[PDB]
């Protein structure tokens, strides 16, 4: 399996689809997105890769996206799907029981607390319960059939708060806040923890990384990344965490770092073909 990265931004929103591989360290160029997009999220359901939300920030516009598009690795074709109820730039997404959850994001000045849910078999969206908090740049992960919305930006305050969605019950509950305020962090699940890597705290991009232990309801720091970054892509591959690109306050990163939990160390694994922020990432 490979690490797919879709979209992103460098001087303008990008159409790139590229696939990386632990084993041989090779970068592969695949079919372009049909509409450029940055600030999207990526996820895999079935064996199909989905690009959700974002915006097309171009020399001729800056259009927030409600689009859902689906990539089949078997066919190398992007296929459009039904669109979300609203555009969601800087969206977060998680997958529960083959359903895609779209969390927060912005449309113009509107910072969403709304959440909606997609079913690939029926190709259609519905509104579920909204978060307690408006959040863009929100990190989202799924642990034991529960969905977590972590950090982000409400329009004025960047957030260290996190809340959890109970699908059986359609209720959001606040949990213990992170030690660090983080918007545009990379958020994933590795083993039985929710990791939050990097982000922006309103003053600095961060290299720190913390993880939430659901049993103890406690956030604890782990080893920091080499390079501070926000708006990074992140995914789990072979029980290791990869972070891809991002922005550090001046430079668009091509750096890719890899976290090994057994050794608690980050190692620079590769570089993307070009630096960019705001990608969507997933593995299949």
């Amino acid at each position: 399996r490979l690490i797919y990265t879709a979209g992103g931004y460098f001087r303008q929103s990008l159409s790139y689809l590229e696939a990386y591989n632990p084993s041989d360290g090779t970068w592969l160029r695949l079919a372009d997105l049909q509409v450029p997009r940055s600030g999207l999220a990526g996820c895999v359901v079935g064996g199909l890769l989905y690009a959700v939300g974002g915006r097309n920030n171009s020399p001729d516009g800056n259009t927030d996206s409600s689009a859902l598009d689906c990539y089949n690795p078997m066919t190398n074709q992007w296929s459009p799907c039904a669109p979300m109820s609203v555009p969601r730039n800087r969206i977060g997404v998680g997958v529960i029981d083959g359903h895609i959850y779209a969390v927060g994001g912005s449309h113009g000045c509107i910072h969403h607390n709304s959440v909606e849910r997609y079913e690939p078999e029926r190709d259609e969206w519905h509104l579920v319960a909204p978060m307690l908090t408006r959040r863009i740049g929100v990190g989202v992960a799924v642990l034991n059939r529960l969905l977590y919305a972590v950090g982000g930006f409400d329009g004025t305050n960047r957030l260290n708060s996190a809340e959890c969605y109970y699908p059986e019950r359609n209720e959001w509950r606040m949990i213990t806040a992170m030690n660090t305020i983080r918007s545009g962090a990379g958020v994933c699940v590795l083993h039985n923890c929710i990791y939050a890597a990097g982000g922006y705290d309103g003053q600095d991009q961060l290299n720190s990384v913390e993880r939430y232990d659901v049993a103890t309801a406690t956030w604890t720091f782990v080893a920091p990344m080499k390079h501070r970054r926000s708006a990074l892509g992140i995914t789990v591959h072979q029980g290791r965490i990869y972070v891809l690109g991002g922005y550090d306050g001046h430079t668009f990163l091509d750096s890719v770092e890899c976290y090994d939990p057994d050794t608690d160390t980050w190692s620079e694994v590769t570089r993307m073909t070009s630096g960019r922020s705001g990608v969507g990432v997933a593995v299949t």
Partner: peptide
């Protein structure tokens, strides 16, 4: 520029 993503505002 967006301080967090680098995108042109």
């Amino acid at each position: 520029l967006d301080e967090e993503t680098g995108e042109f505002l």
